[PDB]
């Protein structure tokens, strides 16, 4: 049946089910830190961008798995 479609759908939905949430939490914490130390910025923001890339790596892997399922 539609087992491949169901699998790809569930994989995408569950993979994208909080990595973004963690990214938003990191963003909020970075916003709090920037409000705390506006002078100390753009390096904490750099680490924030690095962490954003690290979090988005999971979504990229999930999307790649879904595409491979589609292939």
């Amino acid at each position: 049946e539609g087992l491949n479609l169901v699998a790809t759908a569930l994989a995408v939905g569950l993979g994208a089910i909080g990595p973004g949430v963690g990214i938003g939490i990191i963003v909020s914490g970075a916003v709090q830190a920037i409000g705390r130390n506006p002078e100390i910025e753009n390096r904490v923001v750099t680490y924030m961008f690095i962490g954003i890339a690290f979090t988005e790596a999971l979504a990229i892997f999930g999307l790649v798995i879904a595409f491979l399922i589609g292939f």
Partner: protein, 222 residues
């Protein structure tokens, strides 16, 4: 009574006889040209509407870019300007402009893909323009244990243009689907301003696309 449909097409393919997305893009370009003509024929230093909108838009965007990242704000001011008056401009044409291609017997993800490719090129034209090795710097170095995530970050940045292209396709096809759902059930527009909220979200999304371009620029800055 829903009759909506997808728009999986190819920009590499020739212009379609229908080409509804290309037609909407042409309409948006014509509207932009007409607005420029109306804002230049009766143009003053601080004209109301004719020059007030231009001042409140271009100068505000330039100030936001300058506060975002210097030394490239003017160097890529026109890039965000191209991102400006786009997506949201088409979104407004697509914001239920009385027709919705009714009685036919911008929205192109390829156009979104084209804009994503343009951004990635800007992420490579200006990207490492002042660095050269900076894109490859701290990648598989003697610090390779931590630099391994650098290649993953580079792949994530590569997908980020695709993410922006999808987000452009996002809320556009989704916006048309919401309009059709309001047409399929609960007729006579909607007591909740769903179309208006969609238009506002589309304008915010165009601004966010410009912001994502500037953000990729600032990421490539260091």
């Amino acid at each position: 009574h829903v009759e909506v449909a997808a728009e999986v097409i190819f920009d590499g393919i020739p212009g379609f006889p229908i080409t509804n997305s290309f037609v909407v893009a042409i309409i948006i370009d014509i509207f932009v040209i007409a607005l420029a003509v109306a804002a230049t024929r009766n143009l003053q230093m601080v004209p109301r509407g004719l020059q007030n909108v231009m001042e409140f838009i271009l100068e505000s965007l330039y100030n936001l870019f300058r506060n975002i990242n210097a030394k490239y704000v003017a160097t890529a001011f026109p890039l965000v300007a191209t991102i400006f008056l786009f997506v949201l401009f088409g979104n407004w044409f697509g914001l239920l402009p009385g027709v919705g291609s009714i009685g036919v017997c911008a929205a192109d993800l390829n156009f979104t893909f084209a804009i994503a490719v343009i951004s990635f090129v800007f992420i490579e034209y200006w990207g490492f323009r002042a660095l050269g090795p900076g894109y490859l710097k701290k990648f598989f170095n003697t610090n390779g244990i931590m630099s391994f995530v650098g290649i993953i970050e580079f792949i994530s940045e590569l997908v980020k243009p695709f993410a922006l292209a999808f987000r452009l396709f996002g809320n556009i096809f989704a916006g048309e689907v919401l309009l059709v759902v309001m047409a399929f059930l609960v007729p006579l527009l909607l007591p909740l301003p769903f179309y208006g909220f969609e238009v506002f979200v589309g304008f915010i999304q165009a601004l966010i696309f410009a912001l994502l371009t500037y953000a990729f620029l600032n990421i490539a800055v260091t």
